[PDB]
Amino acid sequence: MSAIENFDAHTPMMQQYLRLKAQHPEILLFYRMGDFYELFYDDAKRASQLLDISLTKRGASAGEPIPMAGIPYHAVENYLAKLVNQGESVAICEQIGDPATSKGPVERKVVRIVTPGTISDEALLQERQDNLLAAIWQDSKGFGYATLDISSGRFRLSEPADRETMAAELQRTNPAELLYAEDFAEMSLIEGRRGLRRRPLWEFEIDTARQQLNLQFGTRDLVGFGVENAPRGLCAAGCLLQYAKDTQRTTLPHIRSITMEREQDSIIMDAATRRNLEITQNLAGGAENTLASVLDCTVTPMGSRMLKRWLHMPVRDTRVLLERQQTIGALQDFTAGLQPVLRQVGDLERILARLALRTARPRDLARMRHAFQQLPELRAQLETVDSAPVQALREKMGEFAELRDLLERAIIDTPPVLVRDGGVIASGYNEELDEWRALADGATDYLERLEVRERERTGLDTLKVGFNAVHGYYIQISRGQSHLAPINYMRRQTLKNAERYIIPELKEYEDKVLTSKGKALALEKQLYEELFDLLLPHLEALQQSASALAELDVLVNLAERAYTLNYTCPTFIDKPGIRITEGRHPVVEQVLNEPFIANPLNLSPQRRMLIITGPNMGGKSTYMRQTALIALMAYIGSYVPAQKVEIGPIDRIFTRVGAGRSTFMVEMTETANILHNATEYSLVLMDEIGAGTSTYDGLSLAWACAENLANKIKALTLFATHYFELTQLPEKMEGVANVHLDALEHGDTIAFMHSVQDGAASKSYGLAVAALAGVPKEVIKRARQKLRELESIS
Amino acid sequence: AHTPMMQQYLRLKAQHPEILLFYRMGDFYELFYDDAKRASQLLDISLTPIPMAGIPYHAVENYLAKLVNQGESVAICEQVERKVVRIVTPGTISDEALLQERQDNLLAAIWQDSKGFGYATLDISSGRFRLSEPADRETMAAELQRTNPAELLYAEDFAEMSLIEGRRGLRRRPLWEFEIDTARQQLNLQFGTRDLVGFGVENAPRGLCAAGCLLQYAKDTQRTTLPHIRSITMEREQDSIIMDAATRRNLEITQNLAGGAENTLASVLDCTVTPMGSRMLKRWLHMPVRDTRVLLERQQTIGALQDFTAGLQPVLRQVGDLERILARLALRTARPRDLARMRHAFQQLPELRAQLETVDSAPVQALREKMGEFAELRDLLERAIIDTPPVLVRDGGVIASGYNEELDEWRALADGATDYLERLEVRERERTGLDTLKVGFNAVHGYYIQISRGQSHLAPINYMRRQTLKNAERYIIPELKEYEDKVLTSKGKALALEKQLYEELFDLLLPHLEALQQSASALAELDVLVNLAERAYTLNYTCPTFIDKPGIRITEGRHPVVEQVLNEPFIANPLNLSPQRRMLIITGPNMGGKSTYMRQTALIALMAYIGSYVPAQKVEIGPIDRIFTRVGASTFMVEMTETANILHNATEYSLVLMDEIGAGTSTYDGLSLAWACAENLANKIKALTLFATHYFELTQLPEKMEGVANVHLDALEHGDTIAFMHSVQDGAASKSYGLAVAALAGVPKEVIKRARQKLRELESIS
DNA sequence: AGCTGCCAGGCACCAGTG
DNA sequence: ACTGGTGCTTGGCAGCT
Numbered sequence A: 001m002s003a004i005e006n007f008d009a010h011t012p013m014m015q016q017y018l019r020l021k022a023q024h025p026e027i028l029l030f031y032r033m034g035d036f037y038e039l040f041y042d043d044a045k046r047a048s049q050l051l052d053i054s055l056t057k058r059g060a061s062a063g064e065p066i067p068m069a070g071i072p073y074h075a076v077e078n079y080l081a082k083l084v085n086q087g088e089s090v091a092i093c094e095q096i097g098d099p100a101t102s103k104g105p106v107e108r109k110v111v112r113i114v115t116p117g118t119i120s121d122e123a124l125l126q127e128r129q130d131n132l133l134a135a136i137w138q139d140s141k142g143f144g145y146a147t148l149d150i151s152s153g154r155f156r157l158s159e160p161a162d163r164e165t166m167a168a169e170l171q172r173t174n175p176a177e178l179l180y181a182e183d184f185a186e187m188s189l190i191e192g193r194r195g196l197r198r199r200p201l202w203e204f205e206i207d208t209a210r211q212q213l214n215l216q217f218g219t220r221d222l223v224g225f226g227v228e229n230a231p232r233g234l235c236a237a238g239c240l241l242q243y244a245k246d247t248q249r250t251t252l253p254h255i256r257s258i259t260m261e262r263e264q265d266s267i268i269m270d271a272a273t274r275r276n277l278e279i280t281q282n283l284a285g286g287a288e289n290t291l292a293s294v295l296d297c298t299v300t301p302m303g304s305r306m307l308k309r310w311l312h313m314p315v316r317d318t319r320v321l322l323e324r325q326q327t328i329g330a331l332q333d334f335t336a337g338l339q340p341v342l343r344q345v346g347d348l349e350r351i352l353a354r355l356a357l358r359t360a361r362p363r364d365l366a367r368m369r370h371a372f373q374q375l376p377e378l379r380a381q382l383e384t385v386d387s388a389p390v391q392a393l394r395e396k397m398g399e400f401a402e403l404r405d406l407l408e409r410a411i412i413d414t415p416p417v418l419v420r421d422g423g424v425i426a427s428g429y430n431e432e433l434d435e436w437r438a439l440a441d442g443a444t445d446y447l448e449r450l451e452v453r454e455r456e457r458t459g460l461d462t463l464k465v466g467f468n469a470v471h472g473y474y475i476q477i478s479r480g481q482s483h484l485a486p487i488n489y490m491r492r493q494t495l496k497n498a499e500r501y502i503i504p505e506l507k508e509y510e511d512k513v514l515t516s517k518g519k520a521l522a523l524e525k526q527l528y529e530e531l532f533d534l535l536l537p538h539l540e541a542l543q544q545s546a547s548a549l550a551e552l553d554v555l556v557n558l559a560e561r562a563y564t565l566n567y568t569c570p571t572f573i574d575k576p577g578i579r580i581t582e583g584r585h586p587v588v589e590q591v592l593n594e595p596f597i598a599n600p601l602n603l604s605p606q607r608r609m610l611i612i613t614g615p616n617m618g619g620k621s622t623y624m625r626q627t628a629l630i631a632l633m634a635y636i637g638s639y640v641p642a643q644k645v646e647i648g649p650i651d652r653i654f655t656r657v658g659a660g661r662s663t664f665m666v667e668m669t670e671t672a673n674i675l676h677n678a679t680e681y682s683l684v685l686m687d688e689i690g691a692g693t694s695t696y697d698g699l700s701l702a703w704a705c706a707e708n709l710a711n712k713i714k715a716l717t718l719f720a721t722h723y724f725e726l727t728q729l730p731e732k733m734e735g736v737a738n739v740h741l742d743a744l745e746h747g748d749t750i751a752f753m754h755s756v757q758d759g760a761a762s763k764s765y766g767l768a769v770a771a772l773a774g775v776p777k778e779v780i781k782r783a784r785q786k787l788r789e790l791e792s793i794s
Numbered sequence B: 001a002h003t004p005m006m007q008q009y010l011r012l013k014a015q016h017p018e019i020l021l022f023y024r025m026g027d028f029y030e031l032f033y034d035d036a037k038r039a040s041q042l043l044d045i046s047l048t049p050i051p052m053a054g055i056p057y058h059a060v061e062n063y064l065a066k067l068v069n070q071g072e073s074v075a076i077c078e079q080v081e082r083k084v085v086r087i088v089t090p091g092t093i094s095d096e097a098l099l100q101e102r103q104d105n106l107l108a109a110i111w112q113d114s115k116g117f118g119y120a121t122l123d124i125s126s127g128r129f130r131l132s133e134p135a136d137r138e139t140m141a142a143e144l145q146r147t148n149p150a151e152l153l154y155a156e157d158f159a160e161m162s163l164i165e166g167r168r169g170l171r172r173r174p175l176w177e178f179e180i181d182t183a184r185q186q187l188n189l190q191f192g193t194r195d196l197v198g199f200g201v202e203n204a205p206r207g208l209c210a211a212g213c214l215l216q217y218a219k220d221t222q223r224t225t226l227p228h229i230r231s232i233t234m235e236r237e238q239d240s241i242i243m244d245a246a247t248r249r250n251l252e253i254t255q256n257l258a259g260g261a262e263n264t265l266a267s268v269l270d271c272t273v274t275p276m277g278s279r280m281l282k283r284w285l286h287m288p289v290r291d292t293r294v295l296l297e298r299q300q301t302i303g304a305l306q307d308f309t310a311g312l313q314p315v316l317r318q319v320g321d322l323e324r325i326l327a328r329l330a331l332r333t334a335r336p337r338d339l340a341r342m343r344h345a346f347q348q349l350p351e352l353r354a355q356l357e358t359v360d361s362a363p364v365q366a367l368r369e370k371m372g373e374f375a376e377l378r379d380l381l382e383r384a385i386i387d388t389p390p391v392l393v394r395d396g397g398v399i400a401s402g403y404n405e406e407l408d409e410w411r412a413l414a415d416g417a418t419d420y421l422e423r424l425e426v427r428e429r430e431r432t433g434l435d436t437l438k439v440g441f442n443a444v445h446g447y448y449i450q451i452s453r454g455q456s457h458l459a460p461i462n463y464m465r466r467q468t469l470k471n472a473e474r475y476i477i478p479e480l481k482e483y484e485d486k487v488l489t490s491k492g493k494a495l496a497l498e499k500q501l502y503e504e505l506f507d508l509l510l511p512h513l514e515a516l517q518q519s520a521s522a523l524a525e526l527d528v529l530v531n532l533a534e535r536a537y538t539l540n541y542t543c544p545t546f547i548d549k550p551g552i553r554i555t556e557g558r559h560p561v562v563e564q565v566l567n568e569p570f571i572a573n574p575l576n577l578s579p580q581r582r583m584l585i586i587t588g589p590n591m592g593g594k595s596t597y598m599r600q601t602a603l604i605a606l607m608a609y610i611g612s613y614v615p616a617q618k619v620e621i622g623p624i625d626r627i628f629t630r631v632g633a634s635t636f637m638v639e640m641t642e643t644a645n646i647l648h649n650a651t652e653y654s655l656v657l658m659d660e661i662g663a664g665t666s667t668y669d670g671l672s673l674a675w676a677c678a679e680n681l682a683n684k685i686k687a688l689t690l691f692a693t694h695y696f697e698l699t700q701l702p703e704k705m706e707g708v709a710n711v712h713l714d715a716l717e718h719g720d721t722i723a724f725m726h727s728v729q730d731g732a733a734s735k736s737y738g739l740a741v742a743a744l745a746g747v748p749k750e751v752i753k754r755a756r757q758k759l760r761e762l763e764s765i766s
Numbered sequence C: 001a002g003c004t005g006c007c008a009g010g011c012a013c014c015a016g017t018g
Numbered sequence D: 001a002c003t004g005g006t007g008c009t010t011g012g013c014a015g016c017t
C-alpha cells in the first residue's frame, strides 16, 4: 500500500541503491555514502537491532521517508564481527568513481560479501579452529559434498553413500556456512545447522562445475586431481566455488587443487562414535577433557588445527602411518629445541591466504618475515636427525632467503595495523619516497623557527604556531594581545580567548606540506601493493612451507606427548585383530586423581566378540572407549597409551549407546545401521540400552543382534551388557567369549577394581549397587529373598 | 609498586576484594586482574601487561543485570580522587532495568543448629519476608530448589555444605551475624513490635537467626530504611505439599527439562495480565497448600468470577506492576514514569470496584476492599505530573502547569525571554539583510548570533566574533548576554523547584504506603484468580471436591499441557485409587502413554491443591503431604538414589509415581528390586502409588496381595505402522511391541525372526 | 581528565534568485 | 535551471572547563 514506487518516482540515489540491493535481496547491504556505510528500509531496522545503532530517516520529496542507519567507514570491522558471529552475511558496496567528475550519483560496485564461511581476516576467526564453507547435495542414489577452507586453499570433495555417513561427515567437518540444493530430501541432516543457505538447483549442474573448476585450476580436465570420476561431489564443488568467487570477487590463486576423500582411505566413524569418544568436544559441548585437550600442545595455530583434522580422520595407508611414527621416534630428543623456534613461525598459513586475496596487512607481512627468520635455525636443527621423512619436511619448508631480505628492506621493524595512514615502508627502499618525506622533519624544524621569529619580531609573548585539521596552519595570538597583531596577518579562525591568522609564507608551507603528504601516501600504497606483486609468484612453495611447518608442529608435538605420557609405538598385522598389553584410556588417566588401572585386550577373527559384564561403575564403558581411542591414535601415526599394541586394519568404528521422542525406536534404528553396514574389518562397540515393553522383549533382540554380529557379519565386537543371560552366548556361538570387570564384595559394601578378567562374572551386583545408593535395608533383604526364588529356577 | 593510576585501583579493591570492581576510565568502566578474567568469561567481552576488560557507560545497567543474574555483586568506582559510590548485590536490586518482570528475585539466609536448620527469604521489592525450620537435609534442599535465591547468606561453620556448594551468589558470613538476641532486637525494631508473637514466629529461634542476618545484610546493602518490610511469616511443613527437586523438575511446573519456559504447566495456566500476578501464580504452583479452607475459597472465587473476566482483564492489565513500583516509593528511588504508572493504576480502581460490586462471593468482596480507591492521591498526581513525563526528573519538564503558582511564574519569564530572542533573530535579520542570520545556543558560548561564512563579512561592526566554524561565524552582543541571563536563571529556579515539588510528592504518598501495599497485593491475587477463572471456563476444567481420606478418583482426566500442545486428540483416562486400591502396576508399550498418565495424575493433584479447577469431568481427592516422582532419564545410581529417597520419606498420604525401576541392571536383580519396592510401597508405606514397569512378572502381584491391581495400555497395528492407543484399561498387558518397533527401524527380518524364537523360549519358563 | 558538539562526505531537499 | 543553505547515522577529538 501507499507510494507506488516505480523507477521514475525514485531519486537517482535510490534507483542505484535498489538495483544493487536487488542483486542481494535477502542479506544486509552496507552502502557507501562518503565517510559512512549506510543501510535502508528493513536493512536499517534490522541493522539497528543487531548492531545496536540509531534508526533514523532520510528526507523525501516523493511520499514516505526512508528508514536509515549506518556506521563510520573506519569502524566497519567491529560491526562486521558482530554480524558474522550471529550468522549474518553482509554485502560491502564501495564507491568506484570520482564524485568531482560524476554528474549524478557515483558508480558503486559491491566489492565483496562477508559470509560466515568465507571470512579470512584475523579478527573475525578463531585461532585454533577451522572455519569451513561447505556444499551439500542429494539425489536418488546418494550425496555429493565439498568443503573449502578459504583461508588456506584446502578444497575437498566426497560422495558419502548413505544418510549416516553424510551425517558423520557434517559432524567431522562442522562447516560454518552450508550451501544446499533446493530439492534436498533429507532435511533432518541439515535443519538447525548454522549458516544454512538454500541455493538454486542450477548451481549444482555438472557441466558448469567441470568448466568452472578446470578454469580455476588451469587444467583441461580433472583427471590429475582424482575427481574426474566423481560427478556427485563435483556438483557440490561447483556450487561451492561459485559462492566463493561471488563473495571475494577477486582471483583466488591459493585454490590450486581439489582432492577426493574416498571411504576406504580413512576409518569412517559414525556420528555417535565421535561424540562418545569426545575427540574435540565433550558431551556437555565444551572443549575440556577431550582427546585433543590432552594430545594438543602444538605451538602454532595452524599445527593445532592440523592435529584435530588428523584425530577426526585416521588414515589407512600403511606407508603414511609408518613414516609418521618414525618421525615421532626420530624427533623425540629434539623436542625442547625445536618447539620455541616453531612457535615463532606463527600461523603462516592464514597470512598466506590474506596474501593471496591481497588483504594482507603490514603486521601480516612482518610476521611472515619473522617466520622466514626462523627457517635457518630449523634447518640446522633438523639436519642432524637421520630420518628420511624428517629430511623431506626440511626440504618442503624451504628457506626463502630472497624474500626474507625483501621484507627486511621494505618494512619497518614494528609497523602499524593498517597501511591507510602510512608509516609502513622503510627508509632506503624507494628513493622517491624519501625525498617526499622532506616534510616529517621539515615540520617543527620550520614551524618552531617561524614561531620564535614572529614571537620576537612582533613582541607578543602568547604567539604560537599550530595546525588544525579543519582550518589549517595558523599563527595564534591571545584575545588580549590580538589588537596588537600586524595588519598583514590575514584572519583565519576565531575562538573565545584567542585569534588565529594566516600569512602568505605559512599558507605556502601549508599547500606544499599537504600536497607532498598526499604524494608520499599514494606512493607508499603503490609500493605496498607491489610487495604483493613480488611475493605472489612464490605462493605455491610458500603454502607448501606452511604445511610442512604445521605438520612438523603436529609430529614434534606427538613425540613430546608420547614421551611425557608414557606411550609406545603400535605395530600393524595383516588381519582384523587388536592385542593390547597394559592399555589405558588416554583422557580418563589424565583427569583422574588416582592411578588408572591398565588393562589387556585380545581380539581376533577366532575371538571376535567379547561379552563384557560387571557392575554399574565397574568400568565397562571405559574399557570399550579406550579400545577405540587406541585404534584411532594408532591410525593417525601417533604412539599409543599402552605397554604394547598390535592392531589389524579397521574400516569403520560403530558406537551404539543408549538414548527426540521414542528412545527404543532410535536405539533400534541405530542398531540397524550397524547390522546393515558393518563388515569383518569394522570395530563395533555395543553399550547398554533401554528395555523393550516387556521382560525379555529387548533381550531377545540383543541376543539376535549379538548372534548376527558373531555369525554373519563377523566384525570385532565389544558388547557391554547388564543382561547376564548373554553370558551363555559363548557356549552356543563360535567367535564369542565372556569377559568381565572385577569387583570384591566384602561385608555390606562393594569395591570396583577396574580390572578385566577372562570369563563371565561370578554373579551380578544389582542389589549391591542399590544398597550403595541408600535403598532401605528391609527392601534389600526382601529383594534378596525374591532373588533366591529366581535363582532356583535352574 | 606500580604506575600512579594503578596505585589507586589496588587500595580500592582492598575495601571490597570479594566483589568485582568496575573502575571508571573515560567512557568505560574497567576491571583488572582476576576481575578482568572472570568478567570476560561471564559477559562475552574481550581480554587485553595488566589484564583489562571494559564495558561502555551507556550500557552499564544492561551488563550490571547480566552479572547480577549470575550471582555477582558489583562495586562501581567513580571520580583525581575516587571512591566506591555504588554497589548492586543480586538479592537486593529493585531497579526495573536490573530485574526480570515475571521472575521472583530472592535474598536468602541459611544456617545450622545441632537441633536443625534455619531458613529465610526476602523479596526486597514486595516486602515478602518468610522463615522456616526444615526438619532435615532433604526438606532443606527442597526449600532451596523451590525458593531459588539469587543470593544466599550462610554461616562460616556450615557443616552441610553439599546443600549449597554449586549455587550462585554464595555469601560467607561471620557466626555473630546469626546471634539470636541481636536477631530479635533488630527484627522487633524493623516491625515496630515488642515481641514477634503477632507474626507467629516468637518460638522459632533457628528461623529468626537466619532472618536477622538477612535483615542486617539487606539494610547494609541499601543504607536506607526499609519501611515496606513490616511483616514476617512462618511456613510450616504441614501447610504445603512437599516436592523434591527431581519431582519439581519432572512435572515441568515453570521450567521444562531443557531449561526453557515453553511447554510447562505455567505456559498453559499463566495468562495473568500484570507481572505481579504472574509471579504470585508461580509461587502458588510451586507451593500447593493443604488447608482446604483456603482452597474452597479460591474455587468459589474462580466460579463466581466466570462472567466477569472479559470485563476485568483489560482494566487489570493497566494496573501494571504496582508491587515493584511501590518498592521504589519506599526507597525514594521512584522516577516520574513510576509515579505516572501509579497514577494510571489509581485511575482504574473505581471501574474495578463497580465491576466486582455484583459478584456474589465473600472473598471477592474482601479483595475489592483491600484494593482501595485512593482518590485523593489520584488527584494529586493528576495535578502534579504531566500526561507522559520524561524518564528522569533531572532535566525537569515533569511537573504540570497549574500545580504551583511560583513555578508557572518562572516558566513565563523563561518563555518570555526565549520569545524575545526569537524576535531578536527576525529583527536582526531584516536589519542586516542577511538571510542566513539566526540565533543558536551552546554550552561554551551561551546564546550567539550565527552568520554563514559567505555573508559573514557584512556583519555589523557592533557584533563581537567568538567562534569560527568551517562555514559560519558566531558573534555575541550585549543584548544577547542580557537575555541569556534571563532564560538561564529562570530555567534554573524552575528546575530546583520542580525537584523540590517532586520530593514533596514522596512526602504525601508514603504515609499511605501500608494500604498501598495491601492494594497491589490484592490486585495481584485478583489477577491470579480471574486468570484461573478464565482458564477453567476456556479449557473445560471442573471443580474437584475433597474427601477426608486418601484417594484419587478421576473421571475422564487429561494432562493439562500435553492436551494443549499436540494437534492429535487427547484420550482422557480414569483413575481410581483408595486405601482399598492403593497401587496400580502399569504395563504396556513404549510411547504407549504411561509417563503421561502418571504425570497428569500429579498435575491434577497439584492443581487441585492450589485451588484451581482441573482438566477432568470429575475429581474427588484426599489429603496429600508429598508428591514423589521417579519418572524419566551414572543413570542407574541416580535412579536408585531417588528410589531410596521415596522409600525413606513417603507416607500413607503420599502420591508416589515410579517408572521402570529395575531397568539398568540384570533381569533377576532388577525384577527383585522392583518386586520388593512394590511390596514395601503397597504394604509398609501404603502410599497411593502408580508403578510403571516392563516386568510382566510384576503383574502376578494383585493375586499375591491386597490393594494391588493391574492396568495397561495397548497398541494397534495397521498399514505399515503402530498406533499406540493411549487408553488405560483394566488388567495386565498380553502383548509386547519391542520386536515390532525393531522391524520398522530396519532391523533385518531374519534377526527379528531369531528374536521371536528366543522370546517364546524365554517367556515359557514363566 | 571530562562533557559537548563540530566534523568526516556522500546525497537530497528547499527556498531564493535566474 | 543555478547557489547556498539544511538533514543524518557514529567515532574522533578540539576546545572549553
Ligand SMILES: Nc1ncnc2c1ncn2[C@@H]1O[C@H](COP(=O)(O)OP(=O)(O)O)[C@@H](O)[C@H]1O
Binding pocket: A588, A592, A595, A596, A597, A598, A599, A614, A615, A616, A617, A618, A619, A620, A621, A622, A623, A754, A755, B634
Ligand atoms: N580402568 C580404570 N581405572 C581407573 N578408573 C576407571 C577405569 N575404568 C573406569 N574407571 C572409572 O570408573 C567410572 C565408571 O566407569 P564405567 O566404564 O562407566 O563403568 P560402567 O559403564 O560399567 O557402568 C569412570 O568414571 C572412570 O573414572
Ligand SMILES: Nc1ncnc2c1ncn2[C@@H]1O[C@H](COP(=O)(O)OP(=O)(O)O)[C@@H](O)[C@H]1O
Binding pocket: B562, B566, B568, B569, B570, B571, B572, B573, B588, B589, B590, B591, B592, B593, B594, B595, B596, B597, B726, B727
Ligand atoms: N492419553 C493420551 N492421549 C493422547 N496422547 C497421549 C496420551 N498419553 C500420552 N500421549 C502422548 O504419547 C507420547 C508417548 O507416551 P508416554 O507418555 O511417553 O508413555 P510411555 O512411558 O509408555 O512411553 C507422549 O509424549 C504424549 O504426548
Ligand SMILES: [Mg+2]
Binding pocket: A620, A621, A622, A687, A688
Ligand atoms: Mg557404561
Ligand SMILES: [Mg+2]
Binding pocket: B594, B595, B659
Ligand atoms: Mg516413559
